[PDB]
Specification:
Chain lengths: ~280, ~280
C-alpha cells in the first residue's frame, strides 16, 4: 500500500525509524560492546495514522522479514502458542521485526501479556515495534519493555493529498493533480484514514446517482427533469452498453468531506501530548 | 548446522533442489506464461537423512525465508489456526519455503489435513517442501499436492566423514583428518543420524572412564591396577585441577560404532525403492 519513498510526512519520525530501525540492520557491526542497539520501539499516537503500514514500510526498507499480530485478534483457548510460534519464526529468520499492534490492549489475557513479556524477555536480529493509540493505558511493565518511544502524529497538510491519490487508484475519476491538493487542504485536522472513509463515500456517488434519478440525458447519463434530452425513465431501462456513468469530481469528494466530520478529538490529541512529555 | 557448501552428498538431489527450488527463486522472470514453476516438492527417503536440515539448507541458499512445522507437533484444540498463521506469514514474506515435516502423519487431524490442503490450495512466491520417511502412507490427495518428488538416500560412504567432524565440533578430542574418514568407512549402511547417536556415546567415554576406575596414573589420569604410578584411589580424591581427562580417540568411536548397530533395515530401504518407481 505505502512505499518508504513517500512515507516522509511524519515530522521527525521517518528519520527516527531510519536511524532507530534501519541504521542498525543496515550493517550492525557498528554495535559491538557497550553499544547495544534498540530492543523495542513503541509507536504511539492519534488513531488512524497507518502506524501498521509505517511499520511494514520501515521493515521493508530495512530488508528484514515482517511479522505482525494484533493483540485484539489474539486476546479475543491456546493462543498462548501463537505468540511462541510468532517469535519462534521471527527468531529463526534473519533480521526480523515483530509488529504488535494495539499493545495497550494487553492489559484470558494476562497469560498472553505474560507470554509476550517472556518472549520479549531478553529479545540482535529481532526488533519489536509496538503500536498504541492510548499509550497511558499501556501496562507499567509493558511500557518498560519498549525503550525508544516514537511519536506518530496526524497527517501533514500535504501528506493527505497523496492518500486521496491512493484510495482512488484503480477507481476511475477526473481528479486533476491540483484537485488532490485541494482535497488535502480541505482536510485540515483529518485522520490519514478518516480520509479513506470519505473516499469510499466519494467513490459511490457516480452509481449512487444512477440509482436515484428521474430523467437521463443523451450523448445515456442521468440529469435534471429540465434538460436537452431529459427522458423520464429509469436506469432499469438503460441498455447494457448504453449507460455512461457520471464522472467523479472534486464536487463528490468535497460533498464527502463535508458530510464526514473527522474523528480526532482536539482535546484527545492534547492528552497524547502529555505522554510525550512523560515518556518521550 | 549444515551449509549448502557441504550438502553435496545426495547423488542427483543437491542438484535437483538447485534447479527445483533455487533456479526459480534465483530470477523467476524465466517463468512467464505456460511456464509455471514448481508448486510443491516432496522429500521422501530413509529416516535420519537430515531432510529437515537439507530443506533449511536449500532455502537459505535460495535466499528465501524459512518456515518449518512438524505434523507430529501439530496433530498432537485450535491448532487449525497455526497452519493459517504459518502460511499467512510465509505469504506476507517475499519468497518463502514452508517445510512441513512428516506429511505422511497427516492421515482431530483430518481438520488439519484439510486445513493444509486448503492453504496449499492454489499456493509464485511460496514453495512448500514436505518430508516423509513413509511415502506410501501419504494420503492419495496429499501426494497429489506435491508435484516434483525428490528422493534423498542414506549418507555417502564419504559424507559421513564430515558428520563425524560435526557432532564433535566444540568437543575436544584427538581425531586426525584420516580418522574421520575411517569412521566414515566403518559406517557403511549407517544413517546420517545413526552417526550422531554413536558420537554421543563416543564423547562420553573420557568421563565415563574417570568414573569406573580403580587406579590413576600420574603426569592425574585413570589407568590399570598394574602401571608406573598406578595409585589405588578414586576420582572423588582427585584435585579440582589435578585431573587430566583421558583423550578421545578413534578407539572410542569405533567402540561406539561397534555397539550401535544401525537402524536402517535393508528390506525397508528396498520398499522405498518401489515408491520411486511408482511416483518418481
Amino acid at each position: 500500500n505505502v512505499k518508504w519513498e513517500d512515507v516522509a510526512g511524519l515530522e521527525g519520525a521517518k528519520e527516527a525509524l531510519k536511524e532507530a530501525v534501519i541504521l542498525p540492520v543496515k550493517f550492525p557491526h557498528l554495535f559491538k560492546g557497550n553499544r547495544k542497539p534498540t530492543s523495542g520501539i513503541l509507536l504511539y499516537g492519534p488513531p488512524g495514522t497507518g502506524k501498521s503500514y509505517l511499520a511494514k514500510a520501515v521493515a521493508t526498507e530495512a530488508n528484514s522479514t515482517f511479522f505482525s499480530v494484533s493483540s485484539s485478534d489474539l486476546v479475543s483457548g491456546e493462543s498462548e502458542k501463537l505468540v511462541k510460534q510468532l517469535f519462534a519464526m521471527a527468531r529463526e529468520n534473519k533480521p526480523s521485526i515483530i509488529f504488535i499492534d494495539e499493545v495497550d490492549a494487553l492489559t484470558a489475557s494476562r497469560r498472553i501479556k505474560t507470554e509476550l513479556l517472556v518472549q520479549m524477555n531478553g529479545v540482535q536480529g529481532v526488533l519489536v515495534l509496538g503500536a498504541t493509540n492510548i499509550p497511558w493505558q499501556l501496562d507499567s511493565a509493558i511500557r518498560r519493555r519498549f525503550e525508544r518511544r516514537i511519536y506518530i502524529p496526524l497527517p501533514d497538510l500535504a501528506a493527505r493529498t497523496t492518500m486521496f491519490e491512493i484510495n482512488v487508484g484503480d477507481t476511475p475519476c477526473v481528479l486533476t493533480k491540483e484537485d488532490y491538493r485541494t482535497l488535502g487542504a480541505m482536510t485540515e485536522g483529518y485522520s490519514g484514514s478518516d480520509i479513506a472513509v470519505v473516499v469510499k463515500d466519494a467513490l459511490m456517488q457516480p452509481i449512487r446517482k444512477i440509482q436515484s434519478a428521474t430523467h437521463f440525458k443523451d450523448v445515456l447519463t442521468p440529469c435534471s427533469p429540465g434538460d436537452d434530452g431529459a427522458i423520464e425513465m429509469s436506469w432499469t431501462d438503460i441498455e447494457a452498453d448504453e449507460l455512461k456513468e457520471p464522472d467523479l469530481t472534486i464536487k463528490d469528494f468535497l460533498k464527502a468531506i463535508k458530510s464526514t466530520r473527522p474523528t480526532v478529538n482536539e482535546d484527545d490529541l492534547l492528552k497524547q501530548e502529555q505522554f510525550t512529555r512523560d515518556f518521550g
